[PDB]
Design an enzyme around this catalytic site. Structure first.
Site, PDB file in Angstrom:
ATOM      1  N   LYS A 265       0.857  -1.184   0.000  1.00 51.84           N
ATOM      2  CA  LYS A 265       0.000   0.000   0.000  1.00 51.84           C
ATOM      3  C   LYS A 265       0.897   1.240   0.000  1.00 51.84           C
ATOM      4  O   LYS A 265       2.116   1.131   0.186  1.00 51.84           O
ATOM      5  CB  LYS A 265      -0.879   0.010   1.259  1.00 51.84           C
ATOM      6  CG  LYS A 265      -0.088   0.047   2.575  1.00 51.84           C
ATOM      7  CD  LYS A 265      -0.931  -0.386   3.757  1.00 51.84           C
ATOM      8  CE  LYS A 265      -1.293  -1.863   3.687  1.00 51.84           C
ATOM      9  NZ  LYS A 265      -2.349  -2.158   2.680  1.00 51.84           N
ATOM     10  N   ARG A 266       0.298   2.419  -0.156  1.00 46.64           N
ATOM     11  CA  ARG A 266       1.087   3.647  -0.175  1.00 46.64           C
ATOM     12  C   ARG A 266       1.895   3.821   1.097  1.00 46.64           C
ATOM     13  O   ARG A 266       1.421   3.521   2.190  1.00 46.64           O
ATOM     14  CB  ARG A 266       0.212   4.878  -0.394  1.00 46.64           C
ATOM     15  CG  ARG A 266      -0.822   5.161   0.683  1.00 46.64           C
ATOM     16  CD  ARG A 266      -1.219   6.625   0.601  1.00 46.64           C
ATOM     17  NE  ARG A 266      -2.539   6.891   1.160  1.00 46.64           N
ATOM     18  CZ  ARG A 266      -2.992   8.106   1.451  1.00 46.64           C
ATOM     19  NH1 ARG A 266      -2.230   9.167   1.241  1.00 46.64           N
ATOM     20  NH2 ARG A 266      -4.204   8.265   1.954  1.00 46.64           N
TER      21      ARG A 266
ATOM     22  N   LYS B 154      -0.185   4.550   7.812  1.00 48.35           N
ATOM     23  CA  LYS B 154      -0.263   3.185   7.284  1.00 48.35           C
ATOM     24  C   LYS B 154       0.683   2.280   8.052  1.00 48.35           C
ATOM     25  O   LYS B 154       0.608   1.053   7.954  1.00 48.35           O
ATOM     26  CB  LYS B 154       0.104   3.157   5.797  1.00 48.35           C
ATOM     27  CG  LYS B 154      -0.933   3.788   4.878  1.00 48.35           C
ATOM     28  CD  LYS B 154      -2.205   2.962   4.841  1.00 48.35           C
ATOM     29  CE  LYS B 154      -3.167   3.475   3.785  1.00 48.35           C
ATOM     30  NZ  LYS B 154      -4.345   2.581   3.611  1.00 48.35           N
TER      31      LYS B 154
ATOM     32  N   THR C 116      -9.947  -1.853   0.679  1.00 51.03           N
ATOM     33  CA  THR C 116     -10.122  -2.612  -0.552  1.00 51.03           C
ATOM     34  C   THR C 116      -9.114  -3.739  -0.717  1.00 51.03           C
ATOM     35  O   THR C 116      -9.474  -4.830  -1.133  1.00 51.03           O
ATOM     36  CB  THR C 116     -10.098  -1.652  -1.761  1.00 51.03           C
ATOM     37  OG1 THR C 116     -11.386  -1.044  -1.904  1.00 51.03           O
ATOM     38  CG2 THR C 116      -9.739  -2.371  -3.034  1.00 51.03           C
TER      39      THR C 116
ATOM     40  N   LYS D  52      -9.255  -8.244  -0.851  1.00 48.60           N
ATOM     41  CA  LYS D  52      -8.582  -9.005  -1.910  1.00 48.60           C
ATOM     42  C   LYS D  52      -7.801 -10.182  -1.344  1.00 48.60           C
ATOM     43  O   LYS D  52      -7.846 -11.283  -1.893  1.00 48.60           O
ATOM     44  CB  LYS D  52      -7.632  -8.101  -2.702  1.00 48.60           C
ATOM     45  CG  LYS D  52      -8.327  -6.986  -3.455  1.00 48.60           C
ATOM     46  CD  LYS D  52      -7.355  -5.989  -4.052  1.00 48.60           C
ATOM     47  CE  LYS D  52      -8.144  -4.849  -4.677  1.00 48.60           C
ATOM     48  NZ  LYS D  52      -7.186  -3.805  -4.876  1.00 48.60           N
TER      49      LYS D  52
HETATM   50  C1  LIG Z   1      -6.540  -2.649  -4.290  1.00 48.55           C
HETATM   51  C2  LIG Z   1      -5.473  -1.808  -4.510  1.00 48.55           C
HETATM   52  C3  LIG Z   1      -5.329  -0.686  -3.763  1.00 48.55           C
HETATM   53  C4  LIG Z   1      -6.366  -0.356  -2.697  1.00 48.55           C
HETATM   54  O1  LIG Z   1      -6.079   0.804  -1.925  1.00 48.55           O
HETATM   55  P1  LIG Z   1      -5.714   0.706  -0.342  1.00 48.55           P
HETATM   56  O2  LIG Z   1      -6.348   1.964   0.128  1.00 48.55           O
HETATM   57  O3  LIG Z   1      -4.226   0.699  -0.333  1.00 48.55           O
HETATM   58  O4  LIG Z   1      -6.369  -0.575   0.093  1.00 48.55           O
HETATM   59  C5  LIG Z   1      -4.260   0.142  -3.973  1.00 48.55           C
HETATM   60  N1  LIG Z   1      -3.331  -0.162  -4.922  1.00 48.55           N
HETATM   61  C6  LIG Z   1      -3.475  -1.302  -5.670  1.00 48.55           C
HETATM   62  C7  LIG Z   1      -2.383  -1.697  -6.679  1.00 48.55           C
HETATM   63  C8  LIG Z   1      -4.561  -2.120  -5.467  1.00 48.55           C
HETATM   64  O5  LIG Z   1      -4.771  -3.228  -6.291  1.00 48.55           O
HETATM   65  O1  LIG Z   2      -8.860   0.630   1.015  1.00 49.64           O
HETATM   66  C1  LIG Z   2      -8.959   1.187  -0.284  1.00 49.64           C
HETATM   67  C2  LIG Z   2      -9.502   2.598  -0.225  1.00 49.64           C
HETATM   68  O2  LIG Z   2      -8.775   3.373  -1.199  1.00 49.64           O
HETATM   69  C3  LIG Z   2      -9.200   4.741  -1.255  1.00 49.64           C
HETATM   70  O3  LIG Z   2      -8.950   5.326  -0.024  1.00 49.64           O
HETATM   71  C4  LIG Z   2     -10.688   4.824  -1.582  1.00 49.64           C
HETATM   72  O4  LIG Z   2     -11.103   6.179  -1.605  1.00 49.64           O
HETATM   73  C5  LIG Z   2     -11.474   4.067  -0.533  1.00 49.64           C
HETATM   74  O5  LIG Z   2     -12.857   4.115  -0.842  1.00 49.64           O
HETATM   75  C6  LIG Z   2     -10.989   2.631  -0.531  1.00 49.64           C
HETATM   76  O6  LIG Z   2     -11.689   1.885   0.448  1.00 49.64           O
END
Ligand SMILES: *Cc1c(COP(=O)(O)O)cnc(C)c1O
Ligand SMILES: OC[C@H]1O[C@H](O)[C@H](O)[C@@H](O)[C@@H]1O
Ligand SMILES: Nc1ncnc2c1ncn2[C@@H]1O[C@H](COP(=O)(O)O)[C@@H](O)[C@H]1O
Ligand SMILES: Nc1ncnc2c1ncn2[C@@H]1O[C@H](COP(=O)(O)O)[C@@H](O)[C@H]1O
Ligand SMILES: *Cc1c(COP(=O)(O)O)cnc(C)c1O
Ligand SMILES: OC[C@H]1O[C@H](O)[C@H](O)[C@@H](O)[C@@H]1O
Lengths: 834, 834
Positions: free
Chosen positions: B564-565, B570, B672, B676
């Site tokens: 993630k970023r 984080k 998100t 996954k």
């Molecule tokens: C799913 C996904 C994310 C989701 O964002 P988070 O907020 O970090 O969960 C970000 N980058 C990629 C490459 C992803 O596939």
């Molecule tokens: O965790 C992934 C997240 O990425 C970003 O912050 C989106 O705005 C948010 O809706 C999503 O849940």
């Protein structure tokens, strides 16, 4: 990563089947899949592109087969270097050469579309500007028709030169953005970009001379297939596009330097931006040099690449893989623009390949062949050594060492002749050192040629006297030609069909066969058809004129056309003098017999050419008067064709009756347009110079309307004094006209408008307009009276068309292939189903 | 110019036949005709593009049919407005959704190519940046799978945000030039460019308010088809590209103004240059606003156009053709970036369509629906009214009159409540006036929603209290989802096949069906296969790691990933603390049991984020030490995944065992990525916040590795004092680690390197790293011990996968369609052969 399974990757099945059913299936796949459209939302332009792509597939399948053959047989390749390719449109020409016109016609008809409408959607390729480029274009068609492994190399101009538009009588230049909606005939090669260096400095190291600290510019090639006539042979025209190595800097974008971030992008792209950029200042001057080096550097690298990769090419076998280079490569230098190719090939050979200077120079000369188009020594391209020193440092060195080796041998034949040296040196030492590019091209080539018999002679003996004397056999003549495909079969299907209905079709690839039309000279039934064909072409063009100009055109009128660049030496002002004259004659009192004429004048003026633009405004003003004058009526209509170019030429030419080739004697080397009219059924009224000379030798001076001073007469007058004040008073009609122009008869709102055209015509002329005036009008009257007798007019026409056969570019190419490139033409058809 | 002959223009025949023979014929036509290549000169990239185009034809045929159906049935259309579309690659995802993978596999095999090799050639679409954009991407797939007439609207970023590269341990950003060799999945529309105005001034005339003296910028749309899963329904994603109205001035080129000539070109193109341009200065700030208006202006014009053109659309019938607008159009505002769409639609309606302000506002609200992703009020988008006044003058007026009508009704319900006004006004009057974009989105929409249960609650009651109170029914919740196509079937074909081999295939379009896997909870033979599948995915990823990182990977290792970023909230620094800790524990003395782990940390840091970049360098330094340490060996390997993105996510995710979701409590709305991993067979170790919360409610908090302070605990500490100095001495292992970092154990060449990470962790933290340290490591030890027992680990895994079904985006879309857009999903398959 190979196998025999990979042999499944082939065109075997998808090539050859060209019936109407398959052409419809292809149109549909392209309309829907390539264009991502459907019949509910598709525009006319979309259907055009769908047709273009459909035809392109047939084109590309043959190109693949042609090039696979060239690799297999490994012939000597001809590379035509030109800074100009006046290609025009591609759709119909491609259909004809591939023999698809009939099938496509039916297919597009079954799809519910109007093929003539799809055709007009296509833009003219903004890749050329005039005769120099159109010659190259005709050559490409001829080399493909003659089965030669030839290539066309130049620059892909994003905007060409400009498009001409006439608003309020004057000429206003517009940006020719022919690429706005894309070009379905080209194919970029992003995976193959060649580096082109500029500036920097030379570093003589232990292991050689190095050109370091340079500014790189990428050359991105765009490939367009050139089809031969009915022989399945499709060749390649590869044009380079300027791109920056790094077209975007992220670092600068984050800092807010939005100009800096894309700084390198603009600089590089200026190169392939426009054709013939304004050189009236260092910036524009330096850009032409960059454009010249750009084409050279990229093209040569490509040629070396393909050479090494060639079948017998590379290795040791080969001792030096470049020993056979001039036996596998031939590079034609169209004019002096690509002159830089000589020092460059030398740079690659010596610096990069490490070959001995003497060995490289030998190879070089055998590779290059120079073509002189401009006979005027005052018009020979020169470059300030200072400009070259800054931009191409390593190149100035090479031009000097080339020159040094050139002069050293001259004193080794003329040890006391101190004046022959400075007269033959590549460099001109004066209050600013310049470099003669023609000299470089001569010393660097094994052949040199003019475009016409007397042109080449003046080149051989007059201008390059001290060069031809040293080696007579170097200088040659190759009289220009024209392709009978685009200029007869394409533009004039009517005439082409009449000619074939009597003497078959072998004339298309052997134009000289047109002498067999004399066996109809006595036939009046044929001449009936012949003139019928010209009226057909005239009815269609009349529509064009009415629709586009809103001027009532007399179909039974003569159709007196003069289409070419607007220039003082080209005259057309003399033509305007006669136009006003015919008008004044009508104004004398009606009833007097006057054979109706449609005086069409077309061409483009240079942006910084004041005189030329005044002449355009002068003609337009005359037109507005004589077209609106209630008295004149369908007796005389004056039309100035806006934006004259290849596609327009194909339109008017087959509709012309009187071809105006009235340039001052001693100012024309050749005459490509002249030959086009001759072939199409038009009688030529023109001075005995340039192209008219050889056309006369073929049909008979008796068959052309020769007039005015000969080259001797003009030189006779250029020893006494041309006082335009004389003819003025001496000649009645001339006086009236000139006065009308000066008093503002054609410019009531601004009488002093043409004041500048008057002052120049008198006290500052140079091409003797008045001196040939009387001689010009009388000649015209002979045309008018001849035009009164159809049989007499057509009998002479058939005489012209029947003698035009030698003005085919197939003949010219046969000569270059035989006397210069040492390449043998072929009639064999490339097999698509091998 | 129509007829029934034009019905021949169709895809009737060229659509449907998708056998191996035809896929080979298409590959050949594209390789040779589209690419103008052959098997002798074709590269790997060429074969990829040939496959891409082949697949694209099948895609486009269904898109044509889908869109023709939408026109016929004329349903309500959903327009998803997002400034970010994280699409990833398209080849394989397209093959799966269209069911072509099998045939293409065989076809490409018969052609002698390696399909896995062609696949890796494709670049990730540089159109997204993170979760906000990936949500949109998953939504697009879901709306197409659910038969909804939905559209994706955004900006085509020429270079995206940037690609990450790790050289010498630090992060260096590179320009993401994903378009270098082109994008075969898109299709530009040069014949359809919409004008986007900027600056200028307002002119209140007799016949209306006029926005004059503006700077036009053209929006050139690029269309990319989004395929639904096995339903022949392909929708449209239309991204705009900035272009100047006149990208080249000829006049300036002749004068030598080479920058001026192409001046308008750069300005316009900066808009669609990069994603999230540096706003730390006016220039970059103003560009984000231009980018925001750009998407809005162009998108709305397009929607109005298609609306008027619609079947029942336009006329008088219709009284006001826009009366039914909100019944035919639904526009989703993803975050506040496209907030400008409210005043714009109002501008079009009132100024251009001449509809009454009140009538337009009614229509407007029913059209827009807002989605809040950021729960932090300190992070709500605000714009200086000054900046808007300059750039969009007519727009500032509309925001005021919208606000005026908003506040007037608040005093018409709270006539004495002077504080509720300033608290609810769109404008914030202070020492610099700003505009709250979230307020605008709320007043301008009929619906507003959060992304998670507690997120939406905090949005409804906390942040927008005085808004939800006025109209409770406006605020909703729509818990985020994930598409099971790209995230299960595509990335993990092994798991997808195991799941279907037991419960069939209905789970793909109905993920909740995954609860039927519990009927195998007692089955140990199945759990054998389940774990076998994870080892398969782990073997393949290990190769990736070895090849790309040159680090020996223990296949039997755990695979502890946190991608993630890179940000302080984080954590991942906390993860690094534990990593060093496990290292130190090994250093204590070997022999002691330590379950081997592969600690993979991935993500991108913001260019101007000093702390985040130090953390990357910190992790890399730790990695170099623990990977080269002879003692550690195949016990612990640390990997930092370079340039983490969609395609990479698809690679690592199906190979993970422990998903690191350790962000500080109270700093995550959703999650998100979390979903996954859960779906792919990984156990989640993470704080009870954001996404973890609802995943726990589905599988059972007992099944996830919850740890650290809860949101209450953190707020409890944010009232007393978080003195990091305490835990330091209090905790043994923590002390060792922190000291090693400060003394330079991991940076011998520069010991004071991490000096800044120390000072911040202590005296300037904000997310309590130390406070959760001990709690984090103990939790991890529970993971390690659980990992020691396969059955126990897998039984819990099956528990996670079997409860993930509700995290499907099909569910989320079903909710938006039902509660917000008033659109009904459909299972019917589009007929290709109608
Ligand atoms: C799913 C996904 C994310 C989701 O964002 P988070 O907020 O970090 O969960 C970000 N980058 C990629 C490459 C992803 O596939
Ligand atoms: O965790 C992934 C997240 O990425 C970003 O912050 C989106 O705005 C948010 O809706 C999503 O849940
Ligand atoms: N090794 C080769 N074998 C066969 N044909 C070739 C080979 N190299 C080039 N060609 C053909 O030449 C065309 C132009 O290639 P090039 O000469 O490499 O620019 C290619 O598309 C091929 O069709
Ligand atoms: N009048 C129409 N009849 C049928 N299909 C249409 C019509 N207009 C648009 N479409 C379909 O919609 C696709 C996208 O069009 P548009 O909605 O105009 O962007 C087109 O390619 C057509 O396939
Ligand atoms: C043939 C042709 C020319 C030839 O050049 P001139 O020197 O004018 O004969 C120029 N322009 C066009 C459009 C032509 O077709
Ligand atoms: O007449 C057409 C002429 O156009 C250009 O001047 C060409 O350089 C010349 O070769 C040609 O003959």
């Amino acid at each position: 990563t190979d196998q025999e399974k990979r042999r499944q990757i082939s065109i075997r099945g998808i090539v050859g089947v060209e019936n109407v059913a398959e052409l419809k299936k292809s149109f549909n796949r392209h309309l829907h899949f390539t264009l991502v459209k459907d019949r509910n939302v598709a525009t006319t332009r979309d259907y055009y592109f769908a047709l273009a792509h459909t035809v392109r597939d047939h084109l590309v399948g043959r190109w693949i087969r042609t090039q696979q053959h060239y690799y297999d047989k490994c012939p000597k390749r001809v590379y035509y270097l030109s800074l100009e390719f006046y290609m025009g449109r591609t759709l119909q020409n491609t259909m004809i050469n591939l023999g698809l016109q009939n099938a496509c016609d039916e297919a597009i008809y079954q799809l519910g579309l109007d093929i003539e409408e799809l055709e007009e959607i296509e833009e003219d390729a903004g890749l050329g500007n005039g005769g120099l480029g159109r010659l190259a274009a005709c050559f490409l068609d001829s080399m493909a028709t003659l089965g030669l492994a030839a290539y066309g190399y130049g620059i892909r101009y994003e905007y060409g030169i400009f498009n001409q538009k006439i608003r309020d009588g004057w000429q206003v230049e517009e940006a020719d953005d022919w690429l706005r909606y894309g070009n379905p005939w080209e194919k970029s090669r992003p995976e193959f970009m060649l580096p082109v260096h500029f500036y920097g400095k030379v570093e003589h190291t232990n292991t050689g001379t190095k050109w370091i600290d340079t500014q790189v510019v990428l050359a991105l090639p765009y490939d367009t297939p050139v089809p031969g006539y009915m022989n399945n042979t499709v060749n390649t025209m590869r044009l380079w596009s300027a791109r920056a190595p790094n077209d975007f800097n992220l670092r600068d974008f984050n800092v807010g330097d939005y100009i800096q971030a894309v700084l390198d992008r603009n600089l590089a792209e200026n190169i392939s931006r426009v054709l013939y950029p304004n050189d009236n200042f260092f910036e524009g001057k330096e850009l032409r040099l960059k454009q010249e080096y750009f084409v050279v550097a990229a093209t040569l690298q490509d040629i070396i690449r393909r050479f090494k990769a060639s079948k017998f090419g590379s290795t040791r076998g080969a001792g030096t893989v470049f020993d056979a280079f001039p036996d596998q490569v031939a590079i034609q230098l169209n004019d002096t623009h690509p002159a830089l190719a000589i020092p460059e090939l030398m740079r690659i050979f010596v610096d990069i390949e490490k070959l001995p200077w003497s060995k490289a120079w030998e190879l070089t000369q055998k590779t290059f062949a120079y073509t002189n188009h401009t006979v005027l020594p005052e018009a020979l391209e020169r470059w300030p050594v200072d400009l070259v020193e800054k931009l191409l440092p390593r190149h100035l060195e090479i031009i000097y060492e080339i020159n040094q080796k050139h002069l050293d041998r001259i004193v080794a034949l003329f040890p006391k002749d101190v004046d022959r040296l400075r007269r033959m040196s590549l460099i001109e030492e004066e209050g600013s050192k310049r470099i003669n590019m023609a000299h470089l091209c001569i010393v660097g080539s094994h052949a040199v040629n003019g475009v016409a018999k007397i042109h080449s002679d003046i080149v051989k003996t007059k201008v390059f006297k001290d060069f031809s004397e040293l080696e007579p056999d170097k200088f040659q003549n190759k009289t220009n030609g024209i392709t009978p495909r685009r200029w007869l079969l394409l533009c004039n299907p009517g005439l082409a069909e009449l000619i074939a209905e009597k003497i078959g079709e072998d004339y298309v690839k052997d134009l000289s066969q047109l002498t067999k039309l004399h066996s109809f000279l006595g036939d009046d039934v044929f001449l009936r058809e012949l003139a019928k064909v010209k009226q057909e072409n005239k009815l269609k063009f009349s529509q064009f004129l009415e629709t586009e100009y809103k001027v009532k055109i007399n179909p039974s009128s003569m159709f007196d056309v003069q289409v070419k660049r607007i220039h003082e030496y080209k005259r057309q002002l003399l033509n305007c003098l006669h136009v006003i004259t015919m008008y004044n004659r009508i104004k004398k009192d009606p009833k007097k017999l006057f054979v109706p004429r449609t005086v069409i004048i077309g061409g483009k003026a240079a942006p910084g050419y004041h005189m030329a633009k005044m002449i355009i405004k002068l003609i337009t003003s005359v037109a507005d008067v004589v077209n609106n004058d209630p008295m004149v009526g369908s007796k005389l209509k004056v039309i100035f064709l806006e934006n004259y170019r290849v596609s327009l030429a194909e339109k008017v030419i087959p509709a012309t009756d009187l071809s105006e080739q009235i340039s001052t004697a001693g100012t024309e080397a050749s005459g490509t347009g002249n030959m086009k009219f001759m072939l199409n059924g038009a009688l030529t009224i023109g001075t005995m110079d340039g192209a008219n000379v050889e056309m006369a030798e073929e049909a008979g001076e008796e068959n052309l309307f020769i007039f005015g001073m000969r080259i001797d007469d003009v030189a006779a007058l250029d020893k006494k004094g041309y006082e335009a004040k004389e003819y003025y008073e001496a000649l009645p009609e001339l006086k009236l006209v000139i006065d009308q122009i000066d008093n503002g008869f054609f410019s009531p709102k601004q009488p002093d408008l043409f004041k500048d055209i008057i002052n120049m015509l008198f006290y500052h002329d140079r091409f003797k307009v008045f001196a040939d005036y009387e001689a010009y009008v009388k000649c015209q009257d002979k045309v008018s009276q001849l035009y009164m007798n159809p049989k007499a007019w057509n009998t002479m026409v058939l005489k012209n068309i029947a003698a035009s056969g030698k003005f085919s570019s197939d003949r010219t190419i046969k000569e270059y292939a035989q006397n210069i490139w040492n390449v043998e033409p072929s009639d064999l058809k490339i097999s698509l189903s091998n």
